[PDB]
Design an enzyme around this catalytic site. Structure first.
Site, PDB file in Angstrom:
ATOM      1  N   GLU A 115       0.825  -1.216   0.000  1.00 49.56           N
ATOM      2  CA  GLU A 115       0.000   0.000   0.000  1.00 49.56           C
ATOM      3  C   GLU A 115       0.866   1.276   0.000  1.00 49.56           C
ATOM      4  OE1 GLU A 115      -4.147  -1.713   1.887  1.00 49.56           O
ATOM      5  OE2 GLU A 115      -2.338  -1.795   3.142  1.00 49.56           O
ATOM      6  N   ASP A 116       2.182   1.121   0.097  1.00 42.50           N
ATOM      7  CA  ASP A 116       3.137   2.228   0.099  1.00 42.50           C
ATOM      8  C   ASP A 116       3.539   2.562  -1.328  1.00 42.50           C
ATOM      9  OD1 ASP A 116       5.179   3.963   1.553  1.00 42.50           O
ATOM     10  OD2 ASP A 116       6.475   2.719   0.317  1.00 42.50           O
ATOM     11  N   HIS A 117       3.571   3.865  -1.672  1.00 43.13           N
ATOM     12  CA  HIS A 117       3.912   4.397  -2.995  1.00 43.13           C
ATOM     13  C   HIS A 117       5.223   3.832  -3.556  1.00 43.13           C
ATOM     14  CE1 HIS A 117       5.540   7.472  -5.793  1.00 43.13           C
ATOM     15  NE2 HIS A 117       4.343   7.279  -6.355  1.00 43.13           N
TER      16      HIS A 117
END
Length: 140
Positions: A123-125
């Site tokens: 879920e982290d860019h």
């Protein structure tokens, strides 16, 4: 023995994959913080505290002073010390079991420290930039 292929993004995880403690510390620094702020404080921390054996024995107030003014430095200092202690003394299989390691830290470990990336859904860019690149290039 897992070696994560090197991407054009040069995430800090790619530098620290060989030492799961160092990689996990990097996730504590990067979690809800910009890289511009986190990265130089991260190396200064790893230079003074090169291992979990050294970090677990520190007074959090001294760690905190090094971490200043990085957002929530007191909390972060206390998290680093308790996590480093648990990292050594617990018989954990995944770092999600340890204090201060959330989904982001566990996803980072399962992508870089162990060969479980295909089963990870970040879920982290930055993790997603790496992960998407690896999906597109793994067979090449």
């Amino acid at each position: 023995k897992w070696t994560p292929p090197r991407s054009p993004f040069n995430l800090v995880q790619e530098t620290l994959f060989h030492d799961p403690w160092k990689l996990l510390i990097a996730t504590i620094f990067l979690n809800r913080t910009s890289g511009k702020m986190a990265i130089p404080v991260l190396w200064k921390f790893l230079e003074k505290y090169p291992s979990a054996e050294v970090a677990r024995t520190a007074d959090w107030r001294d760690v905190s002073e090094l971490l200043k003014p990085l957002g929530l430095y007191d909390l972060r200092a206390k998290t680093i010390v308790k996590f480093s202690d648990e990292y050594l003394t617990k018989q954990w299989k995944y770092p999600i079991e340890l204090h201060g390691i959330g989904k982001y830290g566990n996803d980072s470990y399962r992508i870089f420290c162990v060969n479980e990336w295909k089963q990870v859904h970040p879920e982290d860019h930055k993790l997603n930039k790496y992960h998407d690149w690896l999906w597109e290039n793994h067979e090449k």
